[PDB]
Amino acid sequence: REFMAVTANNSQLLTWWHNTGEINTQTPVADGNVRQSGLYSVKVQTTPASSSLYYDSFVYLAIPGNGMSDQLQYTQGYNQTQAWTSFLYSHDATVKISRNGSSANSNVVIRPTSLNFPVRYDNQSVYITVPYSPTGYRFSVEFDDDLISLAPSGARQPENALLIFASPFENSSTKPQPGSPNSIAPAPGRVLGLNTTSASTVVFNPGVYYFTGHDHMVLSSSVTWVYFAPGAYVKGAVEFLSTASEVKASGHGVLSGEQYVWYADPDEGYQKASGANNNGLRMWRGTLGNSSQTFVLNGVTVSAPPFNSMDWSGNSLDLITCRVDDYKQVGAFYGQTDGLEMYPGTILQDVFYHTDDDGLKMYYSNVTARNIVMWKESVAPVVEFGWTPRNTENVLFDNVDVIHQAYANAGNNPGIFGAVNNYLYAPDGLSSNHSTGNSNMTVRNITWSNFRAEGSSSALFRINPIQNLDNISIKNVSIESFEPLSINTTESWMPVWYDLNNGKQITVTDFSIEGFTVGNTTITASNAASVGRIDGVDPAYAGSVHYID
Ligand SMILES: OC[C@H]1O[C@H](O[C@H]2[C@H](O)[C@@H](O)[C@@H](OC[C@H]3O[C@@H](O)[C@H](O)[C@@H](O)[C@@H]3O)O[C@@H]2CO)[C@H](O)[C@@H](O)[C@@H]1O
Ligand SMILES: *[C@@H]1O[C@H](CO)[C@@H](O)[C@H](O)[C@H]1NC(C)=O
Ligand SMILES: *[C@@H]1O[C@H](CO)[C@@H](O)[C@H](O)[C@H]1NC(C)=O
Ligand SMILES: *[C@@H]1O[C@H](CO)[C@@H](O)[C@H](O)[C@H]1NC(C)=O
Ligand SMILES: *[C@@H]1O[C@H](CO)[C@@H](O)[C@H](O)[C@H]1NC(C)=O
Ligand SMILES: *[C@@H]1O[C@H](CO)[C@@H](O)[C@H](O)[C@H]1NC(C)=O
Ligand SMILES: *[C@@H]1O[C@H](CO)[C@@H](O)[C@H](O)[C@H]1NC(C)=O
Ligand SMILES: *[C@@H]1O[C@H](CO)[C@@H](O)[C@H](O)[C@H]1NC(C)=O
Ligand SMILES: *[C@@H]1O[C@H](CO)[C@@H](O)[C@H](O)[C@H]1NC(C)=O
Ligand SMILES: *[C@@H]1O[C@H](CO)[C@@H](O)[C@H](O)[C@H]1NC(C)=O
Ligand SMILES: *[C@@H]1O[C@H](CO)[C@@H](O)[C@H](O)[C@H]1NC(C)=O
Ligand SMILES: *[C@@H]1O[C@H](CO)[C@@H](O)[C@H](O)[C@H]1NC(C)=O
Ligand SMILES: *[C@@H]1O[C@H](CO)[C@@H](O)[C@H](O)[C@H]1NC(C)=O
């Protein structure tokens, strides 16, 4: 009979397919179709490797503009595409990646490179042995012959990326059990009525679902759980109306904003928002009442966000906290596609971020984020804590691997650790005016540890102390190489700042750097300014920056 995809669904492996897959790299796919990679084929086999059957794993594809050529102007203008595949596993598995029969043999580089998974080449394919880890893995498979240079940084990156998301099975807390109480499971196609349903749980089983580019998934106040099953592909954006103690989005399916134009405004017919009014549609949105709420986000893959990925509505955001795990953001070629907000008390871990704006937004206290892979594009710092002065304390970001960066100039506000200017007076984040800070606020006890920048990188830090800084520690940061000196994105700086109202000088105390390396060179106080390119620390703060050697 004609060849058909064969998927796995057992206790050791789960893969899926879509019968409405569409090979298309230039226009929007049909409402009920799923854009599929025409370059990469992926199959998976639980070890040990044998003549046993390999199971097909659907490879999704995201393209800049999502097929809407008139939206390309809102991207960085590169020609990169991003494909990805997800599967669940509970045992080591071999991932077999194939390219068409006419593709020549090419070695691959897996990022993060620290993974060091066994890789073998045979019969026009690449076999990667992925070990089972309870927190799974999110990595990039880069073919040497597919690498291109991105001007003007010269960054070497895949023209056609391929991401692999191997995740653990879903427990009873992230997967609705059979015939769950007061649940509703919409049929494939156009999804209607969820904004007025009396259901508590919304279940999206395998299949394709879509709102349209002129509607989104507004969930009624009774909905506290939306589940995206592995194999479910939902074109839309989520907004909880529930003010309950917990609102949850889980499952390993996909939530794609590909049908929305950039900056789509939900209050203006979903047309592009007028005058950068900040009302672009978020992929995750909630609204608070007068009681605490926890947003649990687990397993989901968000693709093609039309604007910032997430923001909650409310007068006091101290009432919201997040619990994020095994989550991915892909195909974010548009600008202002920020990572999630990490509200007070947040624990975020095992995440993959493809973003063209603020990545890790350190705006709230008592936050812990760890095990993150980031494909930074061309705008904003990897870590951001500028824009507005804040009282923020007790933050820990650990094990963050920025596998790629493609900045172009100083105006992009580049840098691993950054704090741009005051948005009220410098909306684009860059200005020589350093007198709009707040001397009554302080960012204290911050730890950024085990950060790694693969390939060419922007500056270690470009921080405007818009409020006082105290006890900020950088421990173990490796930069493979720096972007060209010429583009002004690699020199680190920290200019002296003053209070907006009384002119008091903003203070910086105990800002330490330990375990900083550039390529094969260890950075110390001796070569920090030269090899480390840390030549912009204001003399008033120089005595507060300590190199622990
Ligand atoms: O507050 C908005 C935004 O301001 C800054 O972004 C600026 C960039 O740093 C500049 O390089 C330049 O980039 C233009 C570029 O913006 C993309 O977002 C867009 O997708 C693309 O089509 C366009 O060519 O201008 C922007 C401001 O417009 C700041 O760095 C951001 O963090 C901030 O979100
Ligand atoms: C796997 O099998 C279970 C049990 O029948 C089913 O609920 C689920 O939808 C299947 N998943 C896929 C993607 O095959
Ligand atoms: C086959 O794969 C190569 C990359 O290995 C790609 O450049 C080529 O376009 C593909 N062939 C076609 C046109 O399908
Ligand atoms: C994509 O852009 C790169 C430079 O960034 C260029 O070398 C490559 O040829 C381009 N590919 C196509 C199909 O134009
Ligand atoms: C529910 O959403 C639909 C769009 O699907 C909208 O037309 C309708 O007005 C909404 N109902 C309410 C009560 O808001
Ligand atoms: C929160 O609002 C509810 C309903 O309006 C009310 O019953 C409750 O007393 C409020 N809680 C507080 C702390 O005021
Ligand atoms: C952070 O945690 C501390 C306790 O360690 C608490 O006192 C403080 O209020 C918390 N900050 C916020 C805004 O939640
Ligand atoms: C500082 O932050 C750490 C976590 O990074 C936390 O354990 C500790 O209690 C905080 N308090 C201080 C200032 O020591
Ligand atoms: C780098 O960019 C900053 C901000 O625009 C500017 O002040 C500085 O002079 C630039 N350095 C040069 C001359 O490359
Ligand atoms: C800096 O900006 C503030 C806010 O607009 C303004 O009041 C002040 O005069 C400016 N001073 C400088 C550095 O020119
Ligand atoms: C920094 O890296 C070294 C390995 O070279 C490790 O021993 C140390 O624990 C790391 N520091 C932190 C805070 O993780
Ligand atoms: C900081 O506090 C002083 C009073 O202690 C006040 O005059 C000043 O305006 C405050 N900083 C701000 C918000 O500009
Ligand atoms: C260190 O890196 C530089 C630049 O990549 C290279 O030229 C040099 O050979 C390297 N030295 C060592 C010890 O590997």
Short mmCIF file of N, CA, C and O in Angstrom, two decimals, residues 153-231:
data_model
loop_
_atom_site.label_atom_id
_atom_site.label_comp_id
_atom_site.label_asym_id
_atom_site.label_seq_id
_atom_site.Cartn_x
_atom_site.Cartn_y
_atom_site.Cartn_z
N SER A 153 26.57 41.14 11.92
CA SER A 153 27.34 40.48 12.98
C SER A 153 28.26 39.40 12.42
O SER A 153 29.35 39.15 12.95
N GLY A 154 27.82 38.75 11.34
CA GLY A 154 28.61 37.69 10.76
C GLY A 154 28.36 36.37 11.48
O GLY A 154 29.06 35.39 11.25
N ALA A 155 27.36 36.36 12.35
CA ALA A 155 27.02 35.15 13.10
C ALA A 155 26.73 33.97 12.17
O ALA A 155 26.02 34.12 11.18
N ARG A 156 27.30 32.82 12.50
CA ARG A 156 27.10 31.61 11.70
C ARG A 156 25.94 30.83 12.29
O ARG A 156 26.02 30.31 13.41
N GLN A 157 24.85 30.74 11.54
CA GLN A 157 23.65 30.05 12.02
C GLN A 157 22.93 29.27 10.93
O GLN A 157 23.07 29.57 9.74
N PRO A 158 22.13 28.27 11.33
CA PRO A 158 21.39 27.47 10.36
C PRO A 158 20.43 28.38 9.58
O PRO A 158 19.81 29.27 10.16
N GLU A 159 20.32 28.17 8.28
CA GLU A 159 19.38 28.96 7.51
C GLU A 159 18.02 28.35 7.80
O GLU A 159 17.00 29.03 7.86
N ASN A 160 18.02 27.03 8.00
CA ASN A 160 16.82 26.27 8.28
C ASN A 160 17.03 25.49 9.57
O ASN A 160 17.54 24.38 9.57
N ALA A 161 16.62 26.10 10.68
CA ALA A 161 16.80 25.47 11.98
C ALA A 161 15.91 24.25 12.18
O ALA A 161 14.84 24.14 11.58
N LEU A 162 16.38 23.33 13.02
CA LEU A 162 15.64 22.14 13.38
C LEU A 162 15.81 21.95 14.88
O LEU A 162 16.92 21.70 15.37
N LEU A 163 14.71 22.09 15.62
CA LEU A 163 14.74 21.95 17.07
C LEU A 163 14.07 20.65 17.49
O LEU A 163 13.06 20.24 16.92
N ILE A 164 14.65 19.99 18.49
CA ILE A 164 14.12 18.73 19.01
C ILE A 164 13.71 18.93 20.47
O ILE A 164 14.55 19.30 21.30
N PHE A 165 12.44 18.68 20.77
CA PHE A 165 11.93 18.83 22.13
C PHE A 165 11.52 17.47 22.68
O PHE A 165 10.41 17.00 22.44
N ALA A 166 12.43 16.83 23.42
CA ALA A 166 12.17 15.53 24.02
C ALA A 166 11.69 15.79 25.44
O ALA A 166 12.45 16.31 26.26
N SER A 167 10.46 15.41 25.74
CA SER A 167 9.88 15.67 27.06
C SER A 167 9.38 14.42 27.77
O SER A 167 9.07 13.41 27.14
N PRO A 168 9.28 14.49 29.11
CA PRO A 168 8.80 13.37 29.91
C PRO A 168 7.29 13.21 29.76
O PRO A 168 6.60 14.14 29.32
N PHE A 169 6.78 12.04 30.12
CA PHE A 169 5.34 11.79 30.04
C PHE A 169 4.58 12.73 30.97
O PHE A 169 5.14 13.25 31.94
N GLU A 170 3.30 12.93 30.67
CA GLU A 170 2.45 13.82 31.45
C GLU A 170 1.76 13.11 32.63
O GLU A 170 1.10 12.09 32.43
N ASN A 171 1.92 13.65 33.83
CA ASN A 171 1.29 13.06 35.02
C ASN A 171 -0.15 13.55 35.18
O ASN A 171 -0.65 14.31 34.35
N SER A 172 -0.82 13.11 36.24
CA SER A 172 -2.22 13.49 36.46
C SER A 172 -2.42 14.98 36.72
O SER A 172 -3.54 15.47 36.71
N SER A 173 -1.33 15.71 36.97
CA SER A 173 -1.43 17.14 37.22
C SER A 173 -1.35 17.96 35.95
O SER A 173 -1.75 19.13 35.93
N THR A 174 -0.84 17.36 34.88
CA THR A 174 -0.74 18.09 33.62
C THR A 174 -1.59 17.48 32.51
O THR A 174 -1.72 18.07 31.44
N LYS A 175 -2.16 16.31 32.76
CA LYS A 175 -3.01 15.66 31.77
C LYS A 175 -4.34 15.26 32.40
O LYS A 175 -4.37 14.49 33.36
N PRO A 176 -5.45 15.77 31.86
CA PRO A 176 -6.78 15.45 32.39
C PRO A 176 -7.05 13.96 32.23
O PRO A 176 -6.87 13.40 31.14
N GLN A 177 -7.49 13.32 33.31
CA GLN A 177 -7.77 11.89 33.29
C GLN A 177 -9.03 11.62 32.46
O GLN A 177 -9.75 12.54 32.08
N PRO A 178 -9.30 10.33 32.17
CA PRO A 178 -10.49 9.98 31.37
C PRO A 178 -11.81 10.50 31.93
O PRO A 178 -12.10 10.36 33.12
N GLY A 179 -12.61 11.11 31.06
CA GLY A 179 -13.90 11.65 31.46
C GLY A 179 -13.82 12.60 32.64
O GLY A 179 -14.66 12.55 33.54
N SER A 180 -12.82 13.48 32.62
CA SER A 180 -12.62 14.45 33.69
C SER A 180 -13.92 15.18 34.03
O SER A 180 -14.79 15.35 33.17
N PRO A 181 -14.08 15.60 35.29
CA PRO A 181 -15.29 16.30 35.74
C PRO A 181 -15.46 17.70 35.14
O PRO A 181 -14.53 18.50 35.12
N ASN A 182 -16.68 17.98 34.67
CA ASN A 182 -17.02 19.27 34.09
C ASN A 182 -16.00 19.73 33.05
O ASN A 182 -15.51 20.86 33.09
N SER A 183 -15.69 18.85 32.11
CA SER A 183 -14.74 19.17 31.05
C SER A 183 -15.45 19.22 29.71
O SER A 183 -16.53 18.65 29.53
N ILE A 184 -14.84 19.93 28.76
CA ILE A 184 -15.40 20.04 27.42
C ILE A 184 -14.26 19.80 26.45
O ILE A 184 -13.15 20.30 26.65
N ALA A 185 -14.52 19.01 25.41
CA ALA A 185 -13.50 18.68 24.42
C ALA A 185 -13.99 19.09 23.03
O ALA A 185 -14.69 18.34 22.36
N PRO A 186 -13.62 20.30 22.59
CA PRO A 186 -14.04 20.78 21.27
C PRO A 186 -13.61 19.92 20.09
O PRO A 186 -12.53 19.32 20.10
N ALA A 187 -14.47 19.85 19.09
CA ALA A 187 -14.17 19.08 17.89
C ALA A 187 -13.17 19.88 17.07
O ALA A 187 -13.02 21.09 17.25
N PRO A 188 -12.45 19.21 16.15
CA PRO A 188 -11.47 19.91 15.32
C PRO A 188 -12.14 20.97 14.45
O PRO A 188 -13.33 20.87 14.13
N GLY A 189 -11.38 21.99 14.06
CA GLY A 189 -11.92 23.06 13.23
C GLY A 189 -12.04 24.36 13.99
O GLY A 189 -11.27 24.63 14.92
N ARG A 190 -13.01 25.19 13.60
CA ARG A 190 -13.24 26.47 14.26
C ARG A 190 -13.76 26.21 15.67
O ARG A 190 -14.73 25.47 15.84
N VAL A 191 -13.12 26.81 16.67
CA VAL A 191 -13.53 26.61 18.05
C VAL A 191 -14.38 27.79 18.54
O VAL A 191 -13.92 28.93 18.54
N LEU A 192 -15.60 27.50 18.95
CA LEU A 192 -16.51 28.55 19.41
C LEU A 192 -17.17 28.24 20.75
O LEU A 192 -17.35 27.08 21.12
N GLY A 193 -17.54 29.31 21.46
CA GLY A 193 -18.23 29.17 22.73
C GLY A 193 -17.44 29.05 24.01
O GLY A 193 -18.03 29.08 25.09
N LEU A 194 -16.12 28.94 23.93
CA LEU A 194 -15.33 28.79 25.15
C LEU A 194 -15.37 30.00 26.07
O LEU A 194 -15.13 29.86 27.27
N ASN A 195 -15.69 31.17 25.53
CA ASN A 195 -15.75 32.36 26.37
C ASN A 195 -17.00 32.41 27.25
O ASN A 195 -17.09 33.25 28.15
N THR A 196 -17.95 31.51 27.01
CA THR A 196 -19.17 31.46 27.81
C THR A 196 -19.49 30.06 28.35
O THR A 196 -20.55 29.84 28.93
N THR A 197 -18.57 29.12 28.17
CA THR A 197 -18.78 27.75 28.65
C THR A 197 -18.85 27.69 30.17
O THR A 197 -18.28 28.55 30.86
N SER A 198 -19.54 26.69 30.70
CA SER A 198 -19.64 26.53 32.14
C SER A 198 -18.62 25.49 32.59
O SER A 198 -18.49 25.19 33.78
N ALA A 199 -17.89 24.94 31.62
CA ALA A 199 -16.87 23.93 31.88
C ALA A 199 -15.71 24.49 32.70
O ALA A 199 -15.44 25.69 32.68
N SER A 200 -15.03 23.60 33.43
CA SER A 200 -13.89 23.98 34.25
C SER A 200 -12.60 23.63 33.53
O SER A 200 -11.56 24.27 33.75
N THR A 201 -12.66 22.62 32.68
CA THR A 201 -11.49 22.16 31.95
C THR A 201 -11.77 22.05 30.45
O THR A 201 -12.79 21.48 30.05
N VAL A 202 -10.87 22.61 29.64
CA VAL A 202 -11.01 22.55 28.19
C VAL A 202 -9.94 21.60 27.67
O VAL A 202 -8.75 21.79 27.92
N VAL A 203 -10.36 20.56 26.96
CA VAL A 203 -9.44 19.55 26.45
C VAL A 203 -9.34 19.53 24.93
O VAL A 203 -10.34 19.31 24.24
N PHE A 204 -8.13 19.77 24.42
CA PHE A 204 -7.89 19.74 22.98
C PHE A 204 -7.17 18.44 22.67
O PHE A 204 -5.97 18.32 22.89
N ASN A 205 -7.92 17.46 22.17
CA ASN A 205 -7.33 16.17 21.81
C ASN A 205 -6.63 16.30 20.46
O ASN A 205 -6.76 17.31 19.77
N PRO A 206 -5.86 15.27 20.06
CA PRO A 206 -5.16 15.33 18.77
C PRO A 206 -6.04 15.85 17.64
O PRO A 206 -7.18 15.43 17.48
N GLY A 207 -5.49 16.78 16.86
CA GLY A 207 -6.23 17.36 15.76
C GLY A 207 -5.83 18.81 15.56
O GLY A 207 -4.96 19.33 16.27
N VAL A 208 -6.47 19.47 14.60
CA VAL A 208 -6.16 20.86 14.30
C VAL A 208 -7.35 21.73 14.65
O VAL A 208 -8.49 21.44 14.28
N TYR A 209 -7.07 22.80 15.38
CA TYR A 209 -8.10 23.73 15.81
C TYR A 209 -7.67 25.14 15.49
O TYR A 209 -6.48 25.46 15.49
N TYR A 210 -8.64 26.00 15.23
CA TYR A 210 -8.30 27.37 14.93
C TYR A 210 -9.40 28.31 15.31
O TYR A 210 -10.58 27.96 15.36
N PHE A 211 -9.00 29.52 15.64
CA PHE A 211 -9.97 30.52 15.95
C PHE A 211 -9.93 31.17 14.57
O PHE A 211 -10.58 30.66 13.66
N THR A 212 -9.18 32.23 14.40
CA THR A 212 -9.01 32.88 13.10
C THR A 212 -8.10 33.99 13.51
O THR A 212 -7.73 34.05 14.68
N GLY A 213 -7.75 34.86 12.58
CA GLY A 213 -6.90 35.98 12.94
C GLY A 213 -7.75 37.11 13.50
O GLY A 213 -7.22 38.17 13.81
N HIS A 214 -9.05 36.88 13.64
CA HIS A 214 -9.95 37.92 14.17
C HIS A 214 -10.77 37.48 15.38
O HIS A 214 -11.89 37.96 15.59
N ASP A 215 -10.20 36.59 16.19
CA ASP A 215 -10.85 36.09 17.40
C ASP A 215 -9.74 35.32 18.14
O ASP A 215 -8.72 34.98 17.54
N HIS A 216 -9.91 35.10 19.44
CA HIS A 216 -8.90 34.32 20.16
C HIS A 216 -9.56 33.49 21.25
O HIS A 216 -10.78 33.57 21.44
N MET A 217 -8.78 32.66 21.94
CA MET A 217 -9.34 31.79 22.95
C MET A 217 -9.60 32.45 24.30
O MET A 217 -8.84 32.29 25.25
N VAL A 218 -10.68 33.22 24.36
CA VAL A 218 -11.08 33.84 25.61
C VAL A 218 -11.77 32.71 26.35
O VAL A 218 -12.74 32.14 25.85
N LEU A 219 -11.27 32.38 27.53
CA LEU A 219 -11.84 31.30 28.33
C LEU A 219 -12.73 31.88 29.42
O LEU A 219 -12.32 32.79 30.14
N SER A 220 -13.95 31.35 29.54
CA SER A 220 -14.91 31.83 30.54
C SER A 220 -14.33 31.83 31.95
O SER A 220 -13.35 31.14 32.23
N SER A 221 -14.96 32.58 32.84
CA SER A 221 -14.49 32.67 34.22
C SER A 221 -14.49 31.34 34.97
O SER A 221 -13.91 31.23 36.05
N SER A 222 -15.15 30.32 34.42
CA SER A 222 -15.19 29.02 35.08
C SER A 222 -14.04 28.10 34.65
O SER A 222 -13.74 27.11 35.32
N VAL A 223 -13.38 28.45 33.55
CA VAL A 223 -12.27 27.64 33.05
C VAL A 223 -10.98 27.90 33.82
O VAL A 223 -10.45 29.02 33.84
N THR A 224 -10.46 26.86 34.46
CA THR A 224 -9.23 26.96 35.23
C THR A 224 -8.14 26.05 34.67
O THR A 224 -7.03 26.00 35.19
N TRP A 225 -8.46 25.33 33.60
CA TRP A 225 -7.49 24.43 32.99
C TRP A 225 -7.74 24.23 31.51
O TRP A 225 -8.83 23.83 31.10
N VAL A 226 -6.73 24.54 30.70
CA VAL A 226 -6.83 24.32 29.26
C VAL A 226 -5.69 23.36 28.96
O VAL A 226 -4.54 23.58 29.35
N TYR A 227 -6.02 22.27 28.28
CA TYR A 227 -5.05 21.23 27.97
C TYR A 227 -4.84 21.04 26.48
O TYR A 227 -5.80 20.89 25.72
N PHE A 228 -3.57 21.06 26.07
CA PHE A 228 -3.20 20.87 24.68
C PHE A 228 -2.53 19.51 24.56
O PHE A 228 -1.34 19.38 24.85
N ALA A 229 -3.28 18.51 24.15
CA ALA A 229 -2.73 17.17 24.03
C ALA A 229 -1.59 17.06 23.03
O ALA A 229 -1.48 17.86 22.10
N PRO A 230 -0.70 16.08 23.24
CA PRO A 230 0.39 15.91 22.29
C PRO A 230 -0.36 15.54 21.01
O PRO A 230 -1.24 14.68 21.04
N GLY A 231 -0.06 16.21 19.90
CA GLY A 231 -0.77 15.91 18.67
C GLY A 231 -1.85 16.93 18.37
O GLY A 231 -2.47 16.91 17.30
#
